[PDB]
Amino acid sequence: CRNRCNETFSYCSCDNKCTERKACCWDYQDICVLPTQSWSCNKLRCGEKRMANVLCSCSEDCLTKKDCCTDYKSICKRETSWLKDQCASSQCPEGFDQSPLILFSMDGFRAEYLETWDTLMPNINKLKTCGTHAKYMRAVYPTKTFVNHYTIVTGLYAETHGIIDNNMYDVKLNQNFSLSGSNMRNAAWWGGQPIWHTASYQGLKAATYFWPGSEVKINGSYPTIYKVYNKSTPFEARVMEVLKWLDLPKAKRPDFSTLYIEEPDTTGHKFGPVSGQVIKSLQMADRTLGMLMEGLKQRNLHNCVNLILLADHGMEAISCNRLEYMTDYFNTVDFFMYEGAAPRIRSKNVPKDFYTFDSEAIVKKLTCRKPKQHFKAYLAKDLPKRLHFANNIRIDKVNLMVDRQWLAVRNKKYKYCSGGTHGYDNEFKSMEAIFLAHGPGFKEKTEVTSFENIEVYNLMCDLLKLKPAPNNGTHGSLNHLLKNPFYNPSPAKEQSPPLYCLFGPVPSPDVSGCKCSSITDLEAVNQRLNLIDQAKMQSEADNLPYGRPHVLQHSKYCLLHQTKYISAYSQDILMPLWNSYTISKSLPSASDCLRLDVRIPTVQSQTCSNYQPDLAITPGFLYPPDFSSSGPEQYDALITSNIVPMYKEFARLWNYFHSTLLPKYATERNGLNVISGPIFDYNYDGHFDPYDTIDQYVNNTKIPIPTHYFVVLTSCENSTKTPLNCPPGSLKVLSFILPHRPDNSESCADKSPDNLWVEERMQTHTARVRDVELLTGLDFYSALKQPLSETLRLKTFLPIFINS
Numbered sequence: 001c002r003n004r005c006n007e008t009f010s011y012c013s014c015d016n017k018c019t020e021r022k023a024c025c026w027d028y029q030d031i032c033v034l035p036t037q038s039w040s041c042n043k044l045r046c047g048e049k050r051m052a053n054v055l056c057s058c059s060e061d062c063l064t065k066k067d068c069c070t071d072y073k074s075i076c077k078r079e080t081s082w083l084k085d086q087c088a089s090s091q092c093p094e095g096f097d098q099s100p101l102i103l104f105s106m107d108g109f110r111a112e113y114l115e116t117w118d119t120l121m122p123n124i125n126k127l128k129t130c131g132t133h134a135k136y137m138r139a140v141y142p143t144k145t146f147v148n149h150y151t152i153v154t155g156l157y158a159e160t161h162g163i164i165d166n167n168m169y170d171v172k173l174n175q176n177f178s179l180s181g182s183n184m185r186n187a188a189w190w191g192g193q194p195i196w197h198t199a200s201y202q203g204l205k206a207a208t209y210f211w212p213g214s215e216v217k218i219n220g221s222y223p224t225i226y227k228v229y230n231k232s233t234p235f236e237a238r239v240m241e242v243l244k245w246l247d248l249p250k251a252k253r254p255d256f257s258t259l260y261i262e263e264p265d266t267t268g269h270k271f272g273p274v275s276g277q278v279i280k281s282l283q284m285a286d287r288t289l290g291m292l293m294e295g296l297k298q299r300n301l302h303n304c305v306n307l308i309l310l311a312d313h314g315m316e317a318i319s320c321n322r323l324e325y326m327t328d329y330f331n332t333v334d335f336f337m338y339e340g341a342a343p344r345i346r347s348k349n350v351p352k353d354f355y356t357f358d359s360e361a362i363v364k365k366l367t368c369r370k371p372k373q374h375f376k377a378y379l380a381k382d383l384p385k386r387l388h389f390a391n392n393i394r395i396d397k398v399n400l401m402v403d404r405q406w407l408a409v410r411n412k413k414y415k416y417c418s419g420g421t422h423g424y425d426n427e428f429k430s431m432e433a434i435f436l437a438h439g440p441g442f443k444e445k446t447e448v449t450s451f452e453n454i455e456v457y458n459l460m461c462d463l464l465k466l467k468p469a470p471n472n473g474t475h476g477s478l479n480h481l482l483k484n485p486f487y488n489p490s491p492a493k494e495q496s497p498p499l500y501c502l503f504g505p506v507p508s509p510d511v512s513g514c515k516c517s518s519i520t521d522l523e524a525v526n527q528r529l530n531l532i533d534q535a536k537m538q539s540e541a542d543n544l545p546y547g548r549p550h551v552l553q554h555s556k557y558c559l560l561h562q563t564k565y566i567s568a569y570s571q572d573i574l575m576p577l578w579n580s581y582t583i584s585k586s587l588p589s590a591s592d593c594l595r596l597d598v599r600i601p602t603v604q605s606q607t608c609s610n611y612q613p614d615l616a617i618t619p620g621f622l623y624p625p626d627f628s629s630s631g632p633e634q635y636d637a638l639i640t641s642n643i644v645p646m647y648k649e650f651a652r653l654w655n656y657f658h659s660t661l662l663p664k665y666a667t668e669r670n671g672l673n674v675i676s677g678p679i680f681d682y683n684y685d686g687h688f689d690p691y692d693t694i695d696q697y698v699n700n701t702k703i704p705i706p707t708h709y710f711v712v713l714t715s716c717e718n719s720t721k722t723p724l725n726c727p728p729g730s731l732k733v734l735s736f737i738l739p740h741r742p743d744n745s746e747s748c749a750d751k752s753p754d755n756l757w758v759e760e761r762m763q764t765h766t767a768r769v770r771d772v773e774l775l776t777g778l779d780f781y782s783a784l785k786q787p788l789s790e791t792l793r794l795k796t797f798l799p800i801f802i803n804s
């Protein structure tokens with residue numbers, strides 16, 4: 001009965017375009033309105049031909065007319081369906097010289113959806129089982145659609161590429177940006193180099209079916225091919241016009257490609273991440289992918305196209321019952337608020353009062369007002385440096401960190417409170433996205449640990465054989481995903497060798513202001529800072545077992561070898577750049593004895609009388625004298641070469657870290673290697689800066705005040721092994737970048753009892769080793785017997801606590 005499905009006029013079930021009568025009749029037509037409303041073709045049609053109006057083609061002249069249905073070749077003609085096919089085990093056609101790349105984004109697909117519902121998404125599940133997949137992939141803060149999409153194709157942080165939020169205001173442009181229409185396509189907003197222009201400049205074709213910015217002329221050009229954004233466009237028709245692109249002639253066949261759909265972001269927003277509707281949209285999404293996988297099969301490139309499946313962010317459940325209102329903290333709410341899970345506060349009157357608007361008073365009124373607020377206010381410079389959310393004029397100073405599942409909004413007329421949303425901290429589980437990968441150059445049946453999304457850009461360029469523009473990702477750290485890693489990482493060279501800080505006598509007279517009444521033979525006690533070549537060797541491998549930090553910053557430093565610690569002292573800051581010591585489990589001891597170091601030139605040292613009374617700053621100890629056995633050993637730490645100016649309120653947390661927290665971490669982890677130092681970042685760019693940049697000092701001195709203090713903790717993931725005998729691959733790292741502040745208002749405790757606020761506080765301030773390097777100009781883990789791409793894996797890693 002074939003003539004002519006949903007037809008007029010010409011047994012039963014061929015008629016009619018009803019013109020309903022009680023019987024149309026059913027049988028042969030229902031499997032028909034299909035070719036027009038479905039992207040799949042059935043049996044009852046297999047071998048049929050074109051029809052006047054259709055979506056997908058089944059059949060019969062279609063394999064070479066370049067139009068038929070992804071499942072046609074298996075559900076019409078019968079060959080192994082991709083889905084029903086094993087994971088084995090082989091290249092592109094010849095009209096395909098180099099391996100193509102498809103970047104497929106399912107907006108709002110959180111990592112948890114995958115682990116929990118994998119069985120409900122057969123095609124994504126097959127793909128994960130046999131592709132190369134990550135446990136989760138992190139987003140950048142704030143977790144919004146454009147921030148993270150454009151981040152994904154530029155390899156850059158929000159603050160560098162400039163799309164720092166859905167809605168933003170730039171005072172220098174005096175302009176507004178909204179995803180809700182024009183002018184968002186104004187190129188003035190978009191910094192950097194999207195992947196599609198990286199392909200265009202270096203000679204490749206890039207086609208985008210929808211990506212944030214694809215419709216925008218960044219730097220004066222578009223993606224070779226792009227699409228005006230329409231959300232009503234059926235997903236399947238995207239997959240079809242995407243597959244059509246690779247049927248194109250090899251000269252205009254696009255090499256790079258993007259695919260994007262709005263689910264399960266839409267349904268996650270309406271009904272929340274744990275809902276039946278969300279599961280439905282996940283199936284929808286898995287179908288959208290299955291088709292693509294099939295058109296990969298229909299053609300012969302399924303094992304050739306490299307495909308990245310990911311999302312920009314996760315989804316978190318919200319409620320009208322969990323909202324913070326600025327009316328609770330402001331008798332007068334008079335200011336502009338960007339509302340949500342990632343709020344900001346600025347002036348209503350812009351440009352004029354943009355800078356004048358007092359962001360610190362606004363933070364100070366939002367601070368410690370109710371015993372348990374569900375958010376925290378920060379000046380951007382005071383945000384955790386892991387977020388890299390500071391250096392942009394668009395990033396307003398006032399920022400709120402909202403607890404997960406909660407929202408911070410202006411008034412009580414707030415309405416979008418139900419369902420789910422995103423924008424929270426990229427450390428929250430609910431915000432993690434998926435990463436899956438299938439293709440040559442990607443291992444099969446491999447899972448990898450979590451990595452950040454700022455890596456993906458390099459990866460794409462490495463797959464496309466390109467040279468990526470400067471970005472925040474660390475090239476080579478993803479080579480564990482790659483059969484043939486395109487780019488081999490090169491150790492950065494030390495640009496500042498060590499200088500010598502030699503031995504000398506006790507000055508006469510000693511004007512340092514130092515006093516230590518307990519030492520009996522002084523030149524003897526000082527003789528312990530002058531090690532013989534093999535005491536120095538033992539200490540050199542016991543306290544710097546992973547190698548000495550290379551110094552890439554131009555600095556004047558020198559190496560101070562002691563038995564229990566080692567440090568590089570820089571005459572530029574009058575303190576050590578870095579300090580390393582190992583504590584081995586196991587393991588009341590502070591300053592009452594203090595003296596100058598005979599190895600430091602006086603003019604280049606801090607003095608005991610530099611820290612005069614009438615101060616909010618005391619000398620803190622980089623190597624804790626807490627950790628050495630009395631007596632002669634403790635003297636080795638009680639020198640002015642081991643001190644850093646610390647705000648007393650910071651010293652509070654720091655001392656609690658030596659005295660209680662560090663011993664516990666050490667015995668919990670079977671000892672630790674500790675390398676700590678200061679950070680000066682007064683331009684809040686996340687880098688080290690010229691020493692002319694430091695804007696604060698110890699009063700009536702030239703002693704620089706560090707903006708942060710960093711601590712890198714190193715041990716073995718095998719608690720059976722110590723930091724010293726741990727094989728490099730299994731090394732465990734917990735890094736800290738602690739804000740150096742005059743008060744603890746951030747813990748909302750300028751009060752007792754040091755207990756549980758310190759650990760929480762540090763917990764939100766962890767960082768990658770890479771973050772510390774960039775802030776200090778230091779290179780770590782130089783002497784590790786390991787492919788360096790592995791060592792890059794260890795340094796992109798960010799420790800996250802379960803609230804622990």
Ligand SMILES: *[C@@H]1O[C@H](CO)[C@@H](O[C@@H]2O[C@H](CO)[C@@H](O[C@@H]3O[C@H](CO[C@H]4O[C@H](CO)[C@@H](O)[C@H](O)[C@@H]4O)[C@@H](O)[C@H](O[C@H]4O[C@H](CO)[C@@H](O)[C@H](O)[C@@H]4O)[C@@H]3O)[C@H](O)[C@H]2NC(C)=O)[C@H](O)[C@H]1NC(C)=O
Nearest residue numbers: 156157160161191192388470471472473685686687690774
């Ligand atoms: C994430 O990744 C990006 C890419 O690496 C980094 O962004 C770069 O940051 C560096 C240093 O902050 C920038 O280098 C600087 O370039 C300035 C000129 O750049 C021109 O072109 C850029 C294009 O983006 C324009 O934005 C800009 O307006 C300029 O027209 C120089 O003027 C700077 O020189 C300073 O040099 C030294 C200090 O080292 C001093 O001697 C000088 O006096 C002078 O002050 C500097 O070289 C670079 O431009 C940025 N690139 C981009 C694309 O923005 C981020 O740093 C990185 N993030 C982190 C935290 O690592």
Ligand SMILES: *[C@@H]1O[C@H](CO[C@@H]2O[C@@H](C)[C@@H](O)[C@@H](O)[C@@H]2O)[C@@H](O[C@@H]2O[C@H](CO)[C@@H](O)[C@H](O)[C@H]2NC(C)=O)[C@H](O)[C@H]1NC(C)=O
Nearest residue numbers: 613614615616617618645646647696697698699700705742
């Ligand atoms: C550095 O000192 C300033 C100012 O010190 C004040 O004036 C001096 C001449 C001397 O008389 C000191 O005893 C005074 O304290 C400090 O700025 C003050 O900080 C305090 C508390 O932090 C605050 O109450 C004052 O308003 C500030 N300004 C003053 C005192 O007028 C500053 O805190 C000191 N910084 C360090 C690192 O010690």
Ligand SMILES: *[C@@H]1O[C@H](CO)[C@@H](O)[C@H](O)[C@H]1NC(C)=O
Nearest residue numbers: 005006007016017018029033
């Ligand atoms: C054929 O498609 C038209 C819409 O173009 C629809 O109105 C009609 O119901 C369809 N015919 C049948 C019987 O499926």
Ligand SMILES: *[C@@H]1O[C@H](CO)[C@@H](O)[C@H](O)[C@H]1NC(C)=O
Nearest residue numbers: 169174175176336348350351
């Ligand atoms: C930015 O948008 C809001 C309008 O909702 C407004 O407060 C502000 O004045 C706008 N900026 C300008 C100057 O257009």
Ligand SMILES: *[C@@H]1O[C@H](CO)[C@@H](O)[C@H](O)[C@H]1NC(C)=O
Nearest residue numbers: 191192193194197219220469
């Ligand atoms: C912008 O394009 C120019 C050439 O048109 C190129 O030299 C430059 O590298 C591009 N800049 C970015 C950020 O892509």
Ligand SMILES: *[C@@H]1O[C@H](CO)[C@@H](O)[C@H](O)[C@H]1NC(C)=O
Nearest residue numbers: 228229230231232233234237
């Ligand atoms: C969006 O796509 C739908 C589906 O084809 C179409 O009907 C509609 O005209 C499109 N809207 C715009 C604004 O182009």
Ligand SMILES: [Ca+2]
Nearest residue numbers: 681687688689
């Ligand atoms: Ca800096």
Ligand SMILES: [Zn+2]
Nearest residue numbers: 107108145312
């Ligand atoms: Zn999104």
Ligand SMILES: [Zn+2]
Nearest residue numbers: 108265269422
């Ligand atoms: Zn969304």
